Design a protein around this ligand. Structure first.
Ligand SMILES: [Mg+2]
Ligand SMILES: [Mg+2]
Ligand SMILES: [Mg+2]
Ligand SMILES: [Mg+2]
Ligand SMILES: [Mg+2]
Ligand SMILES: [Mg+2]
Ligand SMILES: [Mg+2]
Ligand SMILES: [Mg+2]
Ligand SMILES: [Mg+2]
Ligand SMILES: [Mg+2]
Ligand SMILES: [Mg+2]
Ligand SMILES: [Mg+2]
Ligand SMILES: [Mg+2]
Ligand SMILES: [Mg+2]
Ligand SMILES: [Mg+2]
Lengths: 122, 62, 129, 194, 234
RNA sequence: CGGCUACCCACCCGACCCGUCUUGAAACACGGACCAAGGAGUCUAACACGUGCGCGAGUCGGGGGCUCGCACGAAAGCCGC
RNA sequence: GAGGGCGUGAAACCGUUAAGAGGUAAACGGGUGGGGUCCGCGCAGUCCGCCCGGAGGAUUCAACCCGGCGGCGGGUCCGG
């Protein structure tokens, strides 16, 4: 039930900021900032997300387990990748190309990972 | 030139109701009537935009 | 060494002047804001020559360059650091603008986060001593 | 590509590896237009009044209306002219076709015997600087202006010693080229015959 | 896998399936090219013969001291001359039926007993004449616009004509020009397919626009002099 | 060095003072010295049409009663012979 | 710069200081030019990121295997 939930979340929902002519969805598990159906990370059975590590280096990747639904305690598996600028970029690409696992938004995840690595470099 | 009093088609192209299930039905039947090239799909998509009056309740004996 | 945006075209404006309300110069009670003149024998309503101009849909700027700053970015208003990381993916076309009611203690943190994220800020180095 | 190693056999090497950084929202590609050539592949045009051995007036140059002799057309589309340094102090100079006025006078120059080493690449402006930041000296280059010799004077002395025997044959050409063109009050160019 | 190795050959088989189709399409396109070339050649020969026979008949008649009169031209080009506001409905209806709504536009009309009177009704607002072959050629090439649908699509490729009007045999623009200049059984469709030719203002300047051409103006019958005006309007 | 603009000045062209009654308003027709605040199509009952919702030859508890005393409860929940 | 109808302190109006202008009342729209405040840059000296071929140094991993956990996919729907 992805479209049924999107017809409720597309408006009248929290996390949404549209003060200017552009709107932003701002979910804890989301790659881009656009409030769209193909990029929402709360309504699908399979979701990929990247995030800067809490220690100060590396990238954490959150994947929707899909094994047990409606159980947000273990619904997300979190891994940590701390490698050079290319090994992480290749591992994240394999994580979406080898498995089917939502083949789209692969470029979105890769771009976000590269952008957060650019900020982790200094 | 030509008068512009009848240039705008008054027919509706979007359901005024906010029912989510009706919206999903419209989103599905629009794709069907656009792709399958079926006049039945076209007419059943057109009949979903209609209001409460234009969709009369058909009885069982009829 | 300002932050280079993405490709930007030469923005052209159809009208560079702001529309002035009719007879707003003679009386100071009449604000500069434009109001549609609805007189039965007014010159501006029937568009006599030599009078002031009325704003219509024709003066609409190009949609490709609408809401674009002269630097080449499009501004987005922020309040804290949480609403700054949302512009991470759109740093090449969109830029940040800190609100006016943000204190100087919490403003420098936003500036440092934007500098780390390589996000253009329209009002940098503001309210410094 | 497969190269030997120290331990563990040999490992394959992948040339042109994947990039490490991706800029977001990259610019799309063009529409692949046609009929557009670079400057090096353009066809060069010349006016019928500009023939080898013609006098030209340098209007927009730094000489501001000097009479020079035209030698030949280069490959980039610019005219290679020269005035006798004894007559008028102008070296072998590059000029533009549309920026000169051609006088109907002609000089027998067919036996010019122009060298082949000088070309469009021979006439360039090179600027270099030692420091990257700002300093008192002006780049250490423009302070002492260019004074390259033994190559700018060699070809000049090779060409003028051949051009002068052809100019001095005309009864009053060395003075005509010495003079500088100017517009007085009595004549207008639309009626003047050049 | 072996199934993937067989799918490798199936990919080449589908490539050959597309290649044979595109090769047949290219051969058919070359055949249609040759066909339209031959049709244009035949039309040029027909134009030569029809232009020479007009002088042939006159020369063979003048030898016996007897005058020869040609046939009345069956095609007439009409241009709108006057403006929009300030027109009677009796003539505005005819202007709307002649597809002449805005000023300075022209269309071809098949001359008949009804069309002659229709033009006479709106004579003060139109300038009509007998177009020439080169004028028709220019009006179809430069200002040629057809409507495959309710939109005005520019005439650039012969496929645009062959798709909408090819069911009668007018596949090419030369066929269109021939059907226009040699009005026959399929002239109405070819004329209605063409959008009203939006013409520019003349160069030499129109003399006494409100006066008839006979009195010294321009709004009237310009049988042979309308080409000199078309040359400046287009 | 670049800068449109809500800064000032000058030239060229066009430019009569706004609102409503009127076929006709800049009028020798009426109101306005200027500025700040307030200021005018609301609400109830009934009717007609159209739209959204729920049920459907049925529909409606707005009138009362029931559970526990309740800041939110002058709410909400229920009646089923 | 809260001094006994004293929080904040607008407009009409008036005084002073600075700038500019002045015979067709002032004002106004279209287009330029001049002056001034201010803004951004430091002005013959400043564009970014990717790949490769070279010039020097330091590091563990990546190829591959092993231990091993976490998730993906379907075959038997196997014990349920
Ligand atoms: Mg209208
Ligand atoms: Mg109507
Ligand atoms: Mg009126
Ligand atoms: Mg002219
Ligand atoms: Mg009023
Ligand atoms: Mg009255
Ligand atoms: Mg009266
Ligand atoms: Mg009035
Ligand atoms: Mg009055
Ligand atoms: Mg009176
Ligand atoms: Mg009064
Ligand atoms: Mg008020
Ligand atoms: Mg105080
Ligand atoms: Mg006080
Ligand atoms: Mg003064």
């Amino acid at each position: 039930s992805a479209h049924l939930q999107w017809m409720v979340v597309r408006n009248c929902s929290s996390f949404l900021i549209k003060r200017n002519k552009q709107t932003y969805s701002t979910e804890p598990n989301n790659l881009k900032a656009r409030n769209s159906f193909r990029y929402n990370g709360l309504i699908h059975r399979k979701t990929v997300g990247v995030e800067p590590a809490a220690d100060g280096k590396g990238v954490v990747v959150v994947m929707k387990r899909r094994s047990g639904q409606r159980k947000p305690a273990t619904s997300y598996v979190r891994t940590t990748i701390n490698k050079n600028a290319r090994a992480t970029l290749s591992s994240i690409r394999h994580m979406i190309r080898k498995n089917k696992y939502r083949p789209d938004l692969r470029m979105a995840a890769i771009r976000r990972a590269s952008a957060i690595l650019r900020s982790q470099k200094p | 030139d030509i008068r512009h009093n009848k240039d705008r088609k008054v027919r509706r192209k979007e359901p005024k109701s906010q029912d989510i299930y009706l919206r999903l039905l419209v989103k599905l039947y629009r794709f069907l009537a656009r792709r399958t090239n079926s006049t039945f799909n076209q007419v059943v998509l057109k009949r979903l935009f209609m209001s409460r009056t234009n969709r009369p309740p058909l009885s069982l004996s009829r | 060494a300002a932050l280079r945006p993405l490709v930007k075209p030469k923005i052209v404006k159809k009208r560079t002047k702001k529309f002035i309300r009719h007879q707003s110069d003679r009386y100071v009670k009449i604000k500069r804001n434009w109001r549609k003149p609805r007189g039965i024998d007014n010159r501006v309503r029937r568009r006599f020559k030599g009078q002031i101009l009325m704003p219509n849909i024709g003066y609409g700027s190009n949609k490709k360059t609408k809401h674009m700053l002269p630097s080449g970015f499009r501004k987005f208003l922020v309040h804290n650091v949480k609403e700054l990381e949302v512009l991470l993916m759109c740093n090449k076309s969109y830029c940040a603008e800190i609100a006016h009611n943000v204190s100087s203690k919490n403003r420098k943190a936003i500036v440092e986060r934007a500098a780390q994220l390589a996000i253009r800020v329209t009002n940098p180095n503001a309210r410094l001593r | 590509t497969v190269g030997g190693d120290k331990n563990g056999g040999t490992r394959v090497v992948k040339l042109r590896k994947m990039p490490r950084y991706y800029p977001t929202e990259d610019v799309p590609r063009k529409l692949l237009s046609h009929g557009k050539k670079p400057f090096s592949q353009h066809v060069r045009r010349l006016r019928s009044s500009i023939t080898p051995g013609t006098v030209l007036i340098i209007l927009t140059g730094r000489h501001r209306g000097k009479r020079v002799v035209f030698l030949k057309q280069l490959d980039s589309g610019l005219l290679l002219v020269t005035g006798p340094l004894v007559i008028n102090r102008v070296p072998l100079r590059r000029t533009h076709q549309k920026f000169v006025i051609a006088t109907s006078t002609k000089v027998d120059i067919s036996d010019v015997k122009i060298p082949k080493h000088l070309t469009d690449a021979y006439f360039k402006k090179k600027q270099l600087r030692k420091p990257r930041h700002q300093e008192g000296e002006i780049f250490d280059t423009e302070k002492e202006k260019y004074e390259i010799t033994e190559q700018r004077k060699a070809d000049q002395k090779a060409v003028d010693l051949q051009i002068l025997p052809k100019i001095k044959a005309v009864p009053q050409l060395q003075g005509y080229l010495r003079s500088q063109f100017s517009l007085t009050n009595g004549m207008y160019p639309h009626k003047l015959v050049f | 896998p072996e199934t993937l190795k067989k799918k490798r050959r199936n990919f080449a088989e589908l490539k050959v399936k597309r290649l044979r189709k595109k090769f047949a399409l290219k051969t058919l396109r070359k055949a249609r090219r040759k066909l339209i070339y031959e049709k244009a050649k035949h039309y040029h020969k027909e134009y030569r013969q029809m232009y020479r026979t007009e002088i042939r008949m006159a020369r063979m008649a003048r030898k016996a001291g007897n005058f020869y009169v040609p046939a009345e031209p069956k095609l007439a080009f009409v241009i709108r001359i006057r403006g929009i506001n300030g027109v009677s409905p009796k003539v505005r209806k005819v202007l709307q039926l002649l597809r002449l709504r805005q000023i300075f536009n022209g269309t071809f009309v098949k001359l008949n007993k009804a069309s002659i009177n229709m033009l006479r009704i709106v004579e003060p607002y139109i300038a009509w004449g007998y177009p020439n072959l080169k004028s028709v050629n220019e009006l179809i090439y430069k200002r040629g616009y057809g409507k495959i649908n309710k939109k005005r699509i520019a005439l650039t490729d012969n496929s645009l004509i062959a798709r909408s009007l090819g069911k009668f045999g007018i596949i090419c623009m030369e066929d269109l020009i021939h059907e226009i200049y040699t009005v026959g059984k399929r002239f109405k469709e070819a004329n209605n397919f063409l959008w009203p030719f939006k013409l520019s203002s003349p160069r030499g300047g129109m003399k006494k626009k409100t006066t008839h051409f006979v009195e010294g103006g321009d709004a009237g019958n310009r049988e042979d002099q309308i080409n000199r005006l078309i040359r400046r309007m287009n």
